[PDB]
Ligand binder design. Sequence first.
Ligand code: RA7
Ligand code: NA
Length: 330
Amino acid sequence: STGSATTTPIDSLDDAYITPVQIGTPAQTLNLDFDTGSSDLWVFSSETTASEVDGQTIYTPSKSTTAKLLSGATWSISYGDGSSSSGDVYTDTVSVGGLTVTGQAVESAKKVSSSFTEDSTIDGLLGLAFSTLNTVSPTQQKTFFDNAKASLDSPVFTADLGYHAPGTYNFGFIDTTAYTGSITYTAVSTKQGFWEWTSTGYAVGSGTFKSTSIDGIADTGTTLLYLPATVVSAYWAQVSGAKSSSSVGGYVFPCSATLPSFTFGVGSARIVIPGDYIDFGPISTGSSSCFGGIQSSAGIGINIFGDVALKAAFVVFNGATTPTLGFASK
Ligand SMILES: OCc1cnc(N2CCOCC2)s1
Ligand code: NA
């Protein structure tokens, strides 16, 4: 089997991407944030505290002929941005872009934090990190990918995120028309449950490439690129007037600037992030200070190759017995 689904930016900044997902019978279509940095499939639901729902589409298990309560199971998750959600669990049929899984754990939110309520465009998350991170208790559950894997033509999924444009998530096959050149594969550590890999270095603009190992995670659920403070300082020093702002909470730059590109290494290959991709626009409406898309990881404990980096590439998440990541230009 295979599936293929279009993923669409939620706003003009590419703050996140939503992908329609069919849940239940008859289908209930919810727009979920596919997150390679977490391992829970959770949704706004008929159980979510009513004052915490503001425009989201909800899953109603009582209207699905295939829903079953997963009796006694609960879940509770906290993300790197301080957001959280929790609830109970149903099993149901879940379809992504034609690929169907029966018996998928669908985590129904009873509570969500303010950042979820305030984002009317995201109806929940679909986690694509390793199932060791799944929060369901007392019986940990599998991700959609882990449940689909044995049925897939090839045990892979690919992320092809757009810059200010739709892109694609594919399951079970690698679309050789979707990238240029060849795919460079690199080793993955699953020790922390993430798609954790080591970049071979970086360059700023037209500058020399610096060979240095940078261990980080491929995380479709994080907007920005978070790297060590040394690397980030070296980038923003090439932008006149850029500075780290403790009042704003990261690097800002004059909106009049033209940003340099940023290159990261994948083995002997190079992925170039255009300067445009690193513009996250005014800090507040009408401001002439703009927010940078490359920020320090120093106050996180891990480097994160979020959407800023991933959308410059065609990315293969290879879930074979020995997992690997692949990157190609596009
Ligand atoms: O505001 C505290 C700062 C820390 N690092 C800064 N930058 C300035 C621009 O060139 C790179 C480094 S400003
Ligand atoms: Na922000």
